[PDB]
Amino acid sequence: LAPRQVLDLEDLVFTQGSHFMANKRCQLPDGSFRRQRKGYEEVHVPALKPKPFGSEEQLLPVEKLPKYAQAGFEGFKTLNRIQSKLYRAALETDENLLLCAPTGAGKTNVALMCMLREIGKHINMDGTINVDDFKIIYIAPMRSLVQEMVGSFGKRLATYGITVAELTGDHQLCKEEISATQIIVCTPEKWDIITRKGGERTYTQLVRLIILDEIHLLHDDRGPVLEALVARAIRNIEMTQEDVRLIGLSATLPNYEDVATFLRVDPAKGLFYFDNSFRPVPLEQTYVGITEKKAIKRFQIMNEIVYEKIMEHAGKNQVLVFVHSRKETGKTARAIRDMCLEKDTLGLFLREGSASTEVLRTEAEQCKNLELKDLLPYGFAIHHAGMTRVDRTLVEDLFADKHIQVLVSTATLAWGVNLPAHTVIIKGTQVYSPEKGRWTELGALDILQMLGRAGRPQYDTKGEGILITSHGELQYYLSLLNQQLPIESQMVSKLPDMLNAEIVLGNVQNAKDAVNWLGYAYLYIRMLRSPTLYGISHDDLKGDPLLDQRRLDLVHTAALMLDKNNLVKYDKKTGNFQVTELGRIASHYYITNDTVQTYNQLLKPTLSEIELFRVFSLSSEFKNITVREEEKLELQKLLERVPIPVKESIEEPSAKINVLLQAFISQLKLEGFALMADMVYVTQLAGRLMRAIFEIVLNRGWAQLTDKTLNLCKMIDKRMWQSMCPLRQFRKLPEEVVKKIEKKNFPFERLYDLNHNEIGELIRMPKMGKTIHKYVHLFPKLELSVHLQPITRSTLKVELTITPDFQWDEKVHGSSEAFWILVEDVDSEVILHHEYFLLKAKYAQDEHLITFFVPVFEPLPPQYFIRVVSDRWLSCETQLPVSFRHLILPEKYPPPTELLDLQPLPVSALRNSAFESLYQDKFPFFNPIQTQVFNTVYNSDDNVFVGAPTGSGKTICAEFAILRMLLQSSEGRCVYITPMEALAEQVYMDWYEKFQDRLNKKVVLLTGETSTDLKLLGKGNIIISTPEKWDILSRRWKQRKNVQNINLFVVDEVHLIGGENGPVLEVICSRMRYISSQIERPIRIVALSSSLSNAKDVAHWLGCSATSTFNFHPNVRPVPLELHIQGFNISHTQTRLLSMAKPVYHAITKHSPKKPVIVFVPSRKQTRLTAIDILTTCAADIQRQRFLHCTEKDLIPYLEKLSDSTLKETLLNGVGYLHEGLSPMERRLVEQLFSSGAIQVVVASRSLCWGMNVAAHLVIIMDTQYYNGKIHAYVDYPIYDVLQMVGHANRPLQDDEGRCVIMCQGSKKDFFKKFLYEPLPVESHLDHCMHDHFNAEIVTKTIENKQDAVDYLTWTFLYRRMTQNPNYYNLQGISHRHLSDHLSELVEQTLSDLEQSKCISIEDEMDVAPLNLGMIAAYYYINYTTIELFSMSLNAKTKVRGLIEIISNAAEYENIPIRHHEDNLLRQLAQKVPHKLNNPKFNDPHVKTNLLLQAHLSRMQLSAELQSDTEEILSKAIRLIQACVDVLSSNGWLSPALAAMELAQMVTQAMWSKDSYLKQLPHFTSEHIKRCTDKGVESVFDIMEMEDEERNALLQLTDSQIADVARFCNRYPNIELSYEVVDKDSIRSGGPVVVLVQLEREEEVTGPVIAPLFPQKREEGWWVVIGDAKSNSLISIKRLTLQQKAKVKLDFVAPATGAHNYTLYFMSDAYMGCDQEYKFSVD
């Protein structure tokens, strides 16, 4: 860091702004002549003769340019000279251009050619244009110019089918229909504001081309805005590494080549400069300058000058007279009218049609308003933006058809429309500037544009340009209009405000980056090329050619200002910058840094409305405003009429600004023309300044001032006071009708309770009654409902339900309405919590559930208030008290168990040498938690709880308990449960190699199927399982011996009991406790957990003493964690995500530049995007490959495996990523490289946070929400997922500390600050999941009566918490009476539900018994509502089609998620599948499971996540189908039962009901089968009996293909069937009939069922069925799995009268074409 020096900026700045001329000298063309007059002097420069054509360079006729570019040039047959000299550069290259041409030369159509080139790269063959793939931004300088640019461009690109729309003004949070526009047209200041936001990439992602029209605005006071835009754009292009083409369009002024440098233009390829010869129509010009200072006489001179120049054009010649006041237009038109008539009606009949050549047309349109009507009968007309509206557009008409001879207009016309006159006269050049608080000389931009309206391109060969101005000082205008006024940099003027925008953006983090930023500015180039202009000496430049000192000084000076005004924290030493919230707001709302200081110094929570209007007045953007003498009176009359007192402020600027704002809200008409210009200036600014004060004050939680300031923003926008009728906000309601309701002492709210007749009677306007009714019901209105529940004594969880109660109209509300959810304390003094809420039109009249947490303080208040205020509408709010009167706070939690700084335990504390051998090579001692826990877990047989921050190494704490069991028992039995499967598979691998390879005990992992799980539980010493797998086993604990005699039972992550799928965990742990006390040979419970606030309750529950319960606080974590929480106030998720991109990189460089980093992102697509962004930012930081820590050839053997191209590319650059579309191998590979240190950064999706055996030094969580398609909203990550992610920032061996940065919405910030720094409180949710467990317990006779059900509950964790946190479970009170009452009402409701669902029977009000439906639900582990639904929907006539629908409606498929835009995807799927659904909602998980079920049968391949869902669906499809069989057989329906069995075999093989049986064979296709049906092969048996040479002769093959096909036929069921009727003769009506089926196969069975498309290995299952096919009668059924051979017995009851015809059916649940049928008869 080099020494610095503070500069005087007011000395280096070009004070005079745009009017600055560094052009000390000057020259003139050939015609020099000047005429001296009395009062003034005339200067003449003649129109340049046209330059002869150069070598070739002929005009390019439209046919020459490409066929696709033909369109958009209708009306043209050839291109202009300019447009031809660069058709090649514009259309055939992508090079950056800078075009210098005179105004009117047609630079427009050059830019259009550039635009058409971009459109040309998305022609799409037959589809019109890939319109959603690109975007073009067009920066124009004036608002009026923008609007007509849109008009014209739309006319040219309609044939292309392209949307070009305006984006300028103040419309904040601009509509997402900008996604529908491809050419955004705007002003620089607007585009600067949009790109200051951060999420800019949401707009600019697709921007392939930006155009800078009238780029010579650089020299203007507005110039820095242009410098910022381009410097920002250029830098962003470097950071995305995505090409954006820049086109500069400029007027012919000096320094242009330096602008070409600025725009990264190649001088040789993309620079074009054309002098004044290339004007559209040659211009003869007069520059009259007045030498007379006397004010009144000065303007008489001027008026005399206008007069005589007009008259040199009598008949067929039009004159435009530009002036500089909305009203001066008339006082000049009538003045020349007074000048002409007075001197003998001078040259009248301007329209030389005394007999109506243009009089008949000018008197026919005469009935248009005020001054127009006056001047219309003859040649005079007028034009201004003075709200003249459609008149001025029909003045454009008549002036176009050259009827109107003389038009005097404001500058607006010159930019706004395309009408040129033969001669133009500009009068005065003086302009009032509200910002400077005075008159100044007008903008170079303005002059150039209007003077370039001289000479009609088609109707004129010459143009006359008269510029009237003051003689003194002004040949400025001559050099301006004759290629001589240079373009300079004004950057010093606005340096601190620009610096701040770049700091807030994250683009500059310190002084160093700041001087680099300056290097991208236009200022830099100019300081190098003209150091003397910019206050630098040639000697400084010589010894410092890059201007390091100057740029550092410049930056340091600015930074000091920003630090002083509290926008930026800046220290002299490091040169580092820190953004403050004040700076963030200042940048975003474009407010100068002086103002921020004032606001900060003045705003306080008790500001009055009177004082708030004062603070607005003191804003620095008003600092030059004064109170003139000639307005003193009008100001005093305004004051009396406005409502807010303006105290102590006499007529000072402060007071004037104050009443100017009030007068604007009050809609008071003005007459003072200086005053009107000042009002437009403060009122156009008032929106942003107010909104800035709003955000400042909202963020400090200031309740009263947030209300005041928000209302103030709404009042300025709606132009009405808060105390008028809300109905004024509807524009289409006649204003006198509204003032009529205000004239009553009548609350608006009451209109809701009146019909259209009572309303009409109230206003005594009967006609108006119905419309007022309509609008009353259009007004936004929300209803609120709250659901409260205490989490701890300091915090409560709040579920706010928001219910829209109004009629939606898109003409009034548009596509959405926004609201602020605020929660305030009792006194309404503090905002405890707030958040934005967006009510989309799509989901109006739809419930909305917002969940959040609020703080509370032990001497509790009676109420909090929740207000939901609209962000745009006045008087649109709804309030809801939240009573704390009956609130019961939870029991205060005990202190954490003290961490004992013991001497670290050595590995030799394990005495066993075999045991030590698997720890000694990794580490010498155990961590302080491991050593403290050691004596109790390794030298006891008793129950223990371990609560430590995730990462503390709790895994081996359980390993202690396992080793200790192995010591005690030879063939010990240990069951380990983890809530997550991905965790189970991780511990398996880790313990298999530890306990089976090293120690040779058995380690097994339970699976989906029960039989093979029972054997695994048999021979296993270590049983790994998830809770449901163990639930389905341990239900039958009475019957399965192996479940009882287990020695050690381990539960990991027991805090997950509080989460989703937590009840099943709670059930099985409780069962294990019950078994233990009921067998009197205790089972050892070891429970591992994250730090719990309520560990005592978990300890008591699992039978742990306090001395054997270890619960450590998060701040005692072996490796100290440094946690940072970073909020982003951005509601729109996709935007928020994008704006996190840079902070992600900055976190890596700040917190872990050398050590490993994991970045968690919310999705698959984001994982790839984030990694690519890190890479591209790396390269723009010039440190490309800085995350690679080996050579490329080190990686290449591993990368060769991978099949993702992009994954190779990123890894090659040091960054990996992990999503679920990668192979399990590809993921193992990436993890290996990461752990090795080779690659420094992995980006992973959150779903993978459980299945990653990888640790970093820095974990970054990039957003904490994900999309829920089911409720059309983004929802928060479970705190369990976040805790798990954070636990990854943990490397005990190498790191002194772990770091974690969590990036989230501001609405989520306070939440993380609580539940990450403190132990986590957990509750049960078993009460909302009670049915399936009661049903199972009743089926196994563990529950026989109501009392047993109450007793069962005493073993749960639910039972414990109910006393501790009653209001959480809806216990109104904590007495023992309340507990029993609740437990009883709970068992009552559950048992009554189970009975109504036909699962159980309640008898004598106390006893319960299992029924058929209950028994099948427990047997297949199916939810009770599912088999309730099955029995409800199944009938005698259901086919496979209805079966699929029924099964996909199961409640197990309720948790199949709907993801972002999966609806569009599923809608397409619906049109591709065989069966079409009726009224299908595409955000319905059951609709999706249906579609996926058909997609799987049709062998379609889909998105990766749709295939994961297809796998989840299939993982349950078989058990559900078997249930259907059971229910159908119970009802005795034959056909549906057989159908369900076909479904099982056709789900397995993944084929349809009438698909060829050959599809089961590998490698076969419809191409193959076609030649198989032709020869006569239809069955699998038919290829089986074929002899080898003939077999592969049928079609194509390979040695490996035939090998697989043959392998299939050796596992295919070759079974022979044999049957007999036992005592077939002595059988009688009503008696028993016994059918004995013998099954045997000519093969010894070994090998699972082969089914590549079914993702769960299953064994052959069979149904033996007997039926009557005539009556559709299922007589008897049996389900079996046979192995080699087996005897099957099944009986039934004989009917009457002898002979009956029966059928025996043999049915697979795994293969098609195996089904055998045998018919027979009896009696």
Residues lying near ligand SAN in the complex (CB under 6 A) are found at 695, 834-836, 1129, 1131, 1305-1307
In angstroms, what is the minimal distance from the CB of 706 to ligand SAN? 11
Q: 795 has which bridge partners?
A: 855
744-775 burial, b if ≥16 CB within 10 A, otherwise e? eeeeeeebeebebeebbebbebeebbebbbeb
**∠ CA 1218-1222-1228 to the nearest 5 degrees?**
70
C-alpha 404/C-alpha 385 separation (Å) is: 19
* Closest separation in Å from C-beta 689 to ligand SAN: 16
**687 vs 1457, beta carbon nearer ligand SAN:** 687
Place of tokens 């290829």: 1583
Farthest-apart Cα atoms in the chain, separation: 145
Beta bridge partners of 853: 797
Q: How far is the CB of 1306 from ligand SAN (least distance, A)?
A: 3
* Min separation Cβ 695 and ligand SAN, Å: 6
Please state, in angstroms and rounded to a whole number, the distance separating the CA atoms of residues 456 and 914.
100
Q: How far is the CB of 836 from ligand SAN (least distance, A)?
A: 4
Cα–Cα dist 1083/941, whole Å: 9
Of the pair 150, 869, the CB lying nearest ligand SAN is at 869
Binding residues for ATP: 101-108, 948-955
The backbone torsions φ and ψ at residue 1680, rounded to the nearest 5 degrees and listed phi first, read: -150, 165
1129 versus 1425: smaller Cβ distance to ligand SAN:
1129
Residue type for 1172, please? I
Amino acid at 909: A
Residue 1147 has which token pair? 């976190």
Residue placing its CB nearer to ligand SAN in the complex, 1129 or 1163 = 1129
Which CB atom, from 412 or from 1129, has the smaller least distance to ligand SAN?
Answer: 1129
**Residue 861 CB contacts under 8 Å (≥ 6 apart), including other chains:** 825, 826, 884
d(CA 1331, CA 1578): 49
Q: What is the distance between the alpha carbons of residues 97 and 117, in angstroms, rounded to a whole number?
A: 14
Whole-number Cα distances in Å, 930 to 804, 899, 947: 55, 11, 11
Q: For ligand SAN, give the closer residue by CB, 192 or 695.
A: 695
| Helix, strand, or coil (residue 188) | helix
Residue 1249 DSSP class: S
On whether the CB atoms of residues 1474 and 1494 are closer than 8 A, the answer is: yes
CA distance 601 to 39: 54
Q: Where are the beta strands (DSSP E) in 11-80?
A: 34-36, 40-45
Q: How far is the CB of 1145 from ligand SAN (least distance, A)?
A: 22
Instruction: Say which residue the tokens 């200067």 belong to.
Output: 43
Name residue 759's amino acid: I
Cβ of residue 767: shortest distance to ligand SAN, in angstroms?
44
Angle value at C-alpha 1480, between 1474 and 1485, nearest 5 degrees: 95
Q: Considering beta carbons, is residue 1093 or 1307 the nearer one to ligand SAN?
A: 1307
**Cα–Cα separations (whole angstroms), residue 1112 to 1089, 1090, 1104, 1105, 1324:** 10, 9, 16, 16, 22
Query: Is residue 1272 left, alpha or beta, with left meaning phi > 0 and alpha meaning psi from -120 to 50?
Result: left
Q: How far is the CB of 1131 from ligand SAN (least distance, A)?
A: 5
- State the minimum distance, in angstroms, from the CB of residue 687 to ligand SAN: 15
- Angle, vertex CA 722, rays to CA 719 and CA 728, nearest 5: 55
> How far apart are CB 837 and ligand SAN at their closest, in Å?
8
CB of 558 to ligand SAN, least distance (A): 27
Q: Round to whole Å and give the CA distance between 237 and 244.
A: 7
Rounded to a whole number of angstroms, the minimum distance from the CB of residue 509 to ligand SAN is 23
Q: Smallest Cα–Cα separation from 1257: which of 1325, 1155, 1123, 1403?
A: 1155
Contacts of 815 (CB under 8 A, 6+ apart): 175, 176, 177, 840, 841
Give the DSSP letter of residue 1237: T
Closer of 833 and 1142 to ligand SAN (Cβ): 833
Note whether 792 and 893 are within 8 A (CB).
Answer: yes
1286 HSE (CA, 13 A, CB side): 28
* Cα–Cα dist 289/122, whole Å: 54
CB of 613 to ligand SAN, least distance (A): 23
Extract the annotated binding site: 101-108, 948-955
Beta bridge partners of 139: 186, 212
Helix (H) or strand (E) holding 527: helix 522-529
Closer residue to ligand SAN, CB minimum distance, 700 or 1568: 700
Residue closer to ligand SAN, measured from CB, 834 or 1361: 834
Q: What's the min distance (Å) between Cβ of 1308 and ligand SAN?
A: 8
Q: Considering beta carbons, is residue 112 or 585 the nearer one to ligand SAN?
A: 585
Q: Name which of 694 and 1662 has its Cβ closer to ligand SAN.
A: 694
Secondary structure of residue 1591 in the 3-state scheme: helix
- Between 834 and 1333, name the residue whose CB sits nearer to ligand SAN: 834
Q: How far is the CB of 1280 from ligand SAN (least distance, A)?
A: 23
Give the residue with the Cβ less far from ligand SAN, 1137 or 1491: 1137
- Which residue is closest to ligand SAN by CB? 1306
Q: Given the complex with ligand SAN, which of 323 and 692 has the nearer CB atom? A: 692
List the Cα angle 1591/1595/1598 in 5-degree steps.
Answer: 80
